[PDB]
Structure 1
Amino acid sequence: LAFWLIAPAVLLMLAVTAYPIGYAVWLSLQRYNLAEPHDTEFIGLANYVTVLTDGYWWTAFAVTLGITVVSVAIEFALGLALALVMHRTIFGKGAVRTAILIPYGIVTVAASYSWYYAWTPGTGYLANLLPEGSAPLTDQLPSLAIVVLAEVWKTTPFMALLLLAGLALVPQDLLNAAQVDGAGPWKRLTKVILPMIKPAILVALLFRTLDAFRIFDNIYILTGGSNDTGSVSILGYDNLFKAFNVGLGSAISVLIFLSVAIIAFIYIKIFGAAAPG
């Protein structure tokens, strides 16, 4: 069976990864400028030894690291809470599940504009709560903070729905036995519920950690590239469409692709649980 069954899917996948990613590493080996379409030549590691060395890359990298690890930590922690109350609902039958979808269902650009106006000084409902002269969008660490808060609100149903699906399999007898051996809610949650759901949390938290690393819209609208900050997903876009350096912009693409592939490897290797075992 199974070697007939993969064929119609892998047929496409293999092509649309192999040509683009292979062609990426070729372009990164060349001097190549969008304004000079065939008038530049092979250059070895020149794009790497420059992009790995400049100050701008390490800030744009370090900020996506901070934003991903902070936003996933919060998105996970609130993800359990939304999952538990959606699973053991009583008075909120139907409605409790229904209201949880729309922060996933909204388009991220619309959400980010709403947060941008929420925080804009003298014209934002929660901006009006700050002491005068604060204007938080204008400063680096505050601009990080508001994009964390925007990203966290937008993402939490990604976690909570997957973790609810991961919890909904758990047989009630295991929870009754815990309850009659007197494990209070937190004791069971930690000694029974999480160990049962292990693989589904490491799947959900992996795909979130990746998504939270490659996220662009939520910083592009809320002060894109503004006073350092930014993100490696912005820095690569800019060095391609507003500087015309295909050699350098592809080298940024390869260097992040490798630097995220090791993260995809770590949650397979170190924590073990994934699709195959």
Structure 2
Amino acid sequence: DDKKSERRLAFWLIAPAVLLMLAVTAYPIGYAVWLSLQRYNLAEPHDTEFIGLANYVTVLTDGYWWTAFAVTLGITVVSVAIEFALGLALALVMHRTIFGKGAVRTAILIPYGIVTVAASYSWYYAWTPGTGYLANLLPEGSAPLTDQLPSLAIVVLAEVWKTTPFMALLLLAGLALVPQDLLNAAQVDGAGPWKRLTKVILPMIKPAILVALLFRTLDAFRIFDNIYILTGGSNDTGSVSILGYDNLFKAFNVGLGSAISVLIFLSVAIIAFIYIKIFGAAAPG
């Protein structure tokens, strides 16, 4: 029989992956959830007891969570929209361009291969006045890192330049699928250079752009480096990954810093659920 043999092959074939994911990650997830139910503090590990759901209501009722959450959500949707719209454009010029493609393919992927600390300091010194090369282009005394909307705009730029190559590369690799004769068949059926993109290119690459959009969005929600180094926790713009770190690494409140991790996991799970259920062409389909 085929089916009896194919499940038997399939269980060999997934074996190392499900083992390596489960055996390492099941205990850390289980412990990170279980610590959330209790008054655990890393400074007195013997002086701890079960607290029930109290670690969730005490974060969920707090304006510090909502201010940080609103900022991380607003940064997420605005950055991902720009990075996707730009991502298509960068993938197309990285595909179609006649002029020695290896030059663009390297020069457009090198930003992703810059270290996240050097990238964040590069932008931080770039925007301080009298010391950053593009800060001097502003009117006198501008100092845009000092207040809320301009510093948020600077971190969106510092995010878009560094991660639009992720989506541009998955878009390129997905776009290399599309059979040239179906493009020719659109072109001689009178499709313009944009009219074929919206009606032939995109709907054929739909299951590949889901991957780019999904892993990119689930990463964007947990921003940390580009908003801790550059303008570290100032004028209310702390993303929720900073809110988590500040309640764990530099406060030792393990019983709450784990709850502030479970709630971003849940909120990111709702975004993940919506993306797979609205696309339908997802991996298990």
Q: TM-score, normalised by structure 2?
A: 0.94
Change (3 A) 1:100 1:248: same
The correspondence for 2:273, drawn from 265, 269, 276, is 265
Task: State the distance in 1 between where 2:104 and 2:157 align.
Answer: 23
After TM superposition, what 4+ stretches of structure 1 lie above 4 angstroms from structure 2?
Answer: none
Give how far 1:40 is off.
2.1
* 1:170-194 superposed Cα distances (whole Å, 9 cap, x missing partner): 0111111111122111101111110
Task: State the distance in 2 between where 1:104 and 1:270 align.
Answer: 29
Q: Return 169-178 or 9-18, whichever deviates more.
A: 9-18
Give how far 1:271 is off.
2.0
SS of 1:270's equivalent in the other structure is helix
Task: State the distance in 1 between where 2:64 and 2:13 align.
Answer: 46
Give how far 1:55 is off.
0.4
Count how many residue pairs are aligned between Structure 1 and Structure 2: 277
SS of 1:133's equivalent in the other structure is coil
Provide the alpha-carbon RMSD of the alignment.
1.1
SS of 1:275's equivalent in the other structure is coil
* 1:133-187 superposed Cα distances (whole Å, 9 cap, x missing partner): 2111111111111000000000011011100111111011111111112211110
SS of 1:241's equivalent in the other structure is coil
Contact 1:224 1:234 survives alignment (8 Å): no
* 1:185-229 superposed Cα distances (whole Å, 9 cap, x missing partner): 110111111011111111111111111111211111111211211
Task: State the distance in 2 between where 1:252 and 1:150 align.
Answer: 26
Give how far 1:121 is off.
1.1
2:193 equivalent in structure 1: 185
1:101 equivalent in structure 2: 109
Task: State the distance in 2 between where 1:248 and 1:96 align.
Answer: 47
Q: Return 18-27 or 192-201, whichever deviates more.
A: 18-27
SS of 2:89's equivalent in the other structure is helix
Give how far 1:96 is off.
2.2
Task: State the distance in 1 between where 2:251 and 2:105 align.
Answer: 47
Task: State the distance in 2 between where 1:188 and 1:110 align.
Answer: 40
Contact 1:219 1:231 survives alignment (8 Å): yes
The correspondence for 2:80, drawn from 72, 77, 82, is 72
The correspondence for 2:249, drawn from 234, 241, 249, is 241
* 1:93-146 superposed Cα distances (whole Å, 9 cap, x missing partner): 321222111011111211111111111111111100111121111111111110
List gaps (5 residues or longer) in structure 1.
Answer: none
Task: State the distance in 1 between where 2:267 and 2:121 align.
Answer: 30
List gaps (5 residues or longer) in structure 2.
Answer: 1-8
Q: TM-score, normalised by structure 1?
A: 0.97
* 1:8-34 superposed Cα distances (whole Å, 9 cap, x missing partner): 221121122211111112111101212
Contact 1:104 1:158 survives alignment (8 Å): yes
Task: State the distance in 2 between where 1:93 and 1:68 align.
Answer: 31
